[PDB]
DNA sequence: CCGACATCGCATCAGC
DNA sequence: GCTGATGCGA
DNA sequence: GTCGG
């Protein structure tokens, strides 16, 4: 499927799935949406009528109607509206700073504050995640390249071996998966005195060692199994300087490590498609663990697991490398 | 007709 | 001071 | 908004 197939209408889905979670609150009208945009996007055809589309799993009464008035007249009347308003637009707008979701949108532009330029004349009302947000608007709506996540994971493994060289540490996401860019780094994190019946510095003794070479800038939030901030790579002799990314840090028990590291690889799609044909076998798999259901669908303790493939083993199905886990 | 739609760590607020 | 609810991102 | 109990 390319992208000007049904493109006109996923853009229109897409908009529309926007506003009901920033400006109606309604996230699930908002998924909704996204779930039509998705599958309407994998659809090898291009779309003639709303009754041809609303065939789809996603795809309702109320969506053909509107991909009807789209595809005889070229828009949608309620997007237009929406989209000249100032008090919806505005909101909209402020949710795309990291740290302002819906509702401290809604309350900006209910005291006059609607814009970038606003938020920069009031910071004693942004918190410390949103002006760091605010800070670095542009820079985390760029993707990342896979050879700049290639040079951020060096530092990353090096780092981490340095303060402890028995450490285990890998970087997931769609990287794993061997995506040309990314839109942050993910890393998952073990050690072999962490386990589930188990020191509480484990995380911040990373943290702080990323710090001191200067690769982690900032800190959005910091606690004993989860570390979520901003990291630079160093600029190049006389080269301009790289954007700021973000990246996330997770602790996790040696014996949920491996659910950990399947999981955070993804795809989302794939974990479904995994998980669904894991309970068909009897088993069940969430981000911590595998467990086994019993006759009346109670859970057994969790299986040990030493790799992913084990994971694969216990439910009947060969190894799949990261790159083919898209679906 | 009507509830599900995943769930959790951390920061910060509401309340005692 | 604390506990719990809520917002947020994931 | 869509699906399904
Ligand atoms: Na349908
Ligand atoms: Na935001």
Known sequence: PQETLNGGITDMLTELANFEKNVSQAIHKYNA????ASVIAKYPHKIKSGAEAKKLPGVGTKIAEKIDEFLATGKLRK???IRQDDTSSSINFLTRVSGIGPSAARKF????????????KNEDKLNHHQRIGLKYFGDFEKRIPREEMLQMQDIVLNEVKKVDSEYIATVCGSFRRGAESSGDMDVLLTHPSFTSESQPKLL????EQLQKVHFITDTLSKGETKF?????????????????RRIDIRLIPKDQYYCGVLYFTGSDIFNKNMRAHALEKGFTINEYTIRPLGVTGVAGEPLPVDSEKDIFDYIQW??????????
């Open 33 to 36: 949406y996204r779930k039509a």
């Open 79 to 81: 997007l237009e509206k």
């Open 109 to 120: 532009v209910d005291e006059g504050i609607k814009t970038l330029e606003d938020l920069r």
């Open 204 to 207: 911040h003794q990373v943290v």
């Open 228 to 244: 979520m901030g901003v990291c630079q790579l160093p600029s190049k002799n006389d080269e301009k300087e790289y954007p700021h």
């Open 318 to 327: 060969k190894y799949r490398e990261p790159k083919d886990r898209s679906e």
